[PDB]
């Protein structure tokens, strides 16, 4: 079988049954198919959908939560794209301002008056009301002794949510009539209305919409600038720096499995087709005219534009963020069964030798360090991205994907000695790389296509993500495989081509290529070594010749090698001394370092700065264990390590690579992007 489907829309009220149903025809005469389908909720349908029944169905920030949780499980495969000044559209940024002088934060509102949009809201309500109950703000967790609601009261001192009923003290902020004031379809709520609260004197903060205060006086603004998470404040223009939550546009929802496509297209055809710039009397988004609430972004909201896409590793605690995904999962979704409070240090262990290096650790730390198991070490990210992670130290190559994933350099390590750290007067270790070839030989960079490189292992930075980078500058289609004649990169493929270069297996079930030790070639000392019998090149460390060489590799190798014949290959055609290194490397590398969130980073670096002088070799509980220790290798963090050192705040994921060393580690996966690294690039400007 190829490709040729009838998708089937899921629905709400019946107006829109019909229009989902008005399309259907071009459909028989188009490559895939329709059948309109309807049904009293959205819920209903997002059931409708996981009982193999529907297909999928645009669904709102609410909705598109739901949508993928647990008894379902859903998530979005399309994203309505509109129109704006800044950058693309995929979004809608919320806040709450402030007039200028504010006399707080968001440390310390416990008690001032509040302005809201009403209740049961995202930008007003929800985000706000909803973000304090997981920070801690508003302490309520079991609604039977703080019911949110009820618990809203007990922390400002008032408020104009139009959402009466229930709540004291959070309605008195209002302004109408003393009956229809506390009132939903009242006026001094809603965002700009919600203005008129913040703008009067009534309250102290109005959690609006992204630019209002715009909508409203885009003249005056000094008098009420935004107030950020990070205890922050800034100007009003500048939402994107200072907001709560983020949310994206009404995704389409639909089943996790097979038949994928057969919705993009028939949303890919449906589209450029029937999009709004096409000539067949009738607009698939509708043009934007509004009418009768009831014919209301009848299938897709009015203003809207293209539903983009949304490629695979995005669930739906993703398409959302943190931000609105968590605030809301502390009401309903949750309140303790999964999420719970944790004022611990988290981790990332990967495999059955790093959580064991956990279960280990989280002792004497008395459960200070909890530990979430990871199968695959590309998994930490979306991992700590979520937030079920807390921590996890990674390599450089990574801090370059996880950069672009969210996450953030915290503090690199620091192998040399701990003998220095406390201070700042240096900066970072001076570890480079090296393309490092024989005293003579007609390789240079240039005759590089053809020759037997040797290669330390499939990625380790120095022998493969660092030099297939420069090359990829050169070698487009990334067939890294096809641009030397012959090689040996530990951790290839089994035929391969790169791996067959390698003499790995001592001698029994030839394990000839593997990224292990059980090999004659893994790592920087034995790559090296391979330049010599047959190698044409090595791209290894700088010091990683003056080790081997110089009677201190006394195997009969090298028995009397000696630096004195080799030297390194700069990309100028230019060759250097072996150790005019630091002018002519193919990167200079920074160490690795405990990744997170920059919303919970400055006591990670705390609660991991504290966590040394008990466990960590300078720590005085070294009789009970190092964090650094690892029964004999590098698990968890390293284990040469001895200080880790802090990066200085305000960093960045390209900062602490350079921008030399991470044009290439970043230009060298342009050629092939992965989940993740495409996952977290695909929401990064969206």
Not at 259 to 271: G, M, N, R, T
Not at 286 to 303: A, E, I, N
Not at 550 to 577: H, I, P, S, V, Y
């Amino acid at each position: 079988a190829p490709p040729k489907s009838v998708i089937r829309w899921c629905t709400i009220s019946s107006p829109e049954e019909k229009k989902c149903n008005n399309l259907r025809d071009l459909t028989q005469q188009e490559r895939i198919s329709l059948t309109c389908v309807q049904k009293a909720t959205y819920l209903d349908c997002i059931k409708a959908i996981a009982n193999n029944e529907a297909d999928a169905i645009s669904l709102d920030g609410g909705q598109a939560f739901e949508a993928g949780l647990a008894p379902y499980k859903l998530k979005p495969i399309a994203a309505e794209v509109y129109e704006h000044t800044e950058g693309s559209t995929t979004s809608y940024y919320a806040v709450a301002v402030v007039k200028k002088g504010t006399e707080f934060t968001v440390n310390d509102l416990q008690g001032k008056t509040s302005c809201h949009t009403g209740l049961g809201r995202s930008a007003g309500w929800n985000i706000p009301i909803g973000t304090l109950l997981h920070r801690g703000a508003i302490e309520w967790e079991g609604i039977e002794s703080g019911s949110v609601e009820q618990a809203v009261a007990k922390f400002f001192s008032a408020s104009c949510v139009p959402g009466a009923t229930i709540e004291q003290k959070l309605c008195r902020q209002c302004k109408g009539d003393p009956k229809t004031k506390c009132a939903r379809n009242a006026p001094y709520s809603g965002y700009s209305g919600a203005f008129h609260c913040l703008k009067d004197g009534k309250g102290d903060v109005a959690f609006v919409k992204h630019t209002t205060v715009n909508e409203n006086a885009p003249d005056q603004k000094d008098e009420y600038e935004l107030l950020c998470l990070d205890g922050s404040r800034q100007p009003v223009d500048n939402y994107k720096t200072c907001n709560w939550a983020r949310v994206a546009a009404h995704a389409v929802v639909a089943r996790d499995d097979n038949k994928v496509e057969d919705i993009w297209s028939f949303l890919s055809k449906a589209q450029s087709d029937f999009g709004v710039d096409t000539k067949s009397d009738f607009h698939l988004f509708g043009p934007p005219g509004k009418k009768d609430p009831v014919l209301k972004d009848l299938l897709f909201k009015d203003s809207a534009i293209m539903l983009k896409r949304v490629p695979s590793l995005m669930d739906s605690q993703l398409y959302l963020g943190f931000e609105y995904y968590s605030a809301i999962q502390s009401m309903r979704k949750d309140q303790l069964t999964p999420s719970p409070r944790e004022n611990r240090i988290q981790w990332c262990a990967v495999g059955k030798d790093e959580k064991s290096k956990c279960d280990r650790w989280s002792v004497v730390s008395n459960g200070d360090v909890e530990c979430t198991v990871v199968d695959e070490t590309k998994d930490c990210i979306i991992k700590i991205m979520k937030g079920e992670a807390d921590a996890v130290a990674l390599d450089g190559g990574l801090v370059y994907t996880a950069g672009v994933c969210g996450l953030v350099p915290v503090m690199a390590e620091r192998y040399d000695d701990e003998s220095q750290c406390s201070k700042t007067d240096e900066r970072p270790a001076s570890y480079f790389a090296v393309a490092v070839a024989r005293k003579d030989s007609n390789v240079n960079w240039n005759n590089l296509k053809g020759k037997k490189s040797c290669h330390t292992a499939v990625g380790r930075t120095a022998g493969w993500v660092i030099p297939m980078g420069l090359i990829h500058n050169r070698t487009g289609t990334c067939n890294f495989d096809e641009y030397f004649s012959e090689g040996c990169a530990p951790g290839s493929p089994p035929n391969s081509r790169l791996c067959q270069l390698c003499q790995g297996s001592g001698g029994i079930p030839p394990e000839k290529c593997v990224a292990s030790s059980h090999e004659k070639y893994f790592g920087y000392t034995g790559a090296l070594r391979c330049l010599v019998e047959k190698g044409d090149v090595a791209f290894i460390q700088h010091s990683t010749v003056e080790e081997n060489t110089g009677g201190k590799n006394k195997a009969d190798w090298a028995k009397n090698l000696q630096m004195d014949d080799f030297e390194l290959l700069c990309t100028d055609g230019r060759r250097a001394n072996v150790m005019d290194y630091r002018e002519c490397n193919l990167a200079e590398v920074p160490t690795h370092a405990v990744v997170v969130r920059p919303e919970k980073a400055n006591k990670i670096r705390d609660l991991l700065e504290r966590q040394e002088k008990r466990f960590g070799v300078n720590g005085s509980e070294k009789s009970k264990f190092m964090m650094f220790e690892s029964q004999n290798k590098d698990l968890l963090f390293k284990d040469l390590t001895k200080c880790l050192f802090k990066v200085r705040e305000g960093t960045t994921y390209k900062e602490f690579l350079g921008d030399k060393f991470y044009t290439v580690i970043s230009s060298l996966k342009t050629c092939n992007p992965s989940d993740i690294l495409q996952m977290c690039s695909f929401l990064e400007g969206k």
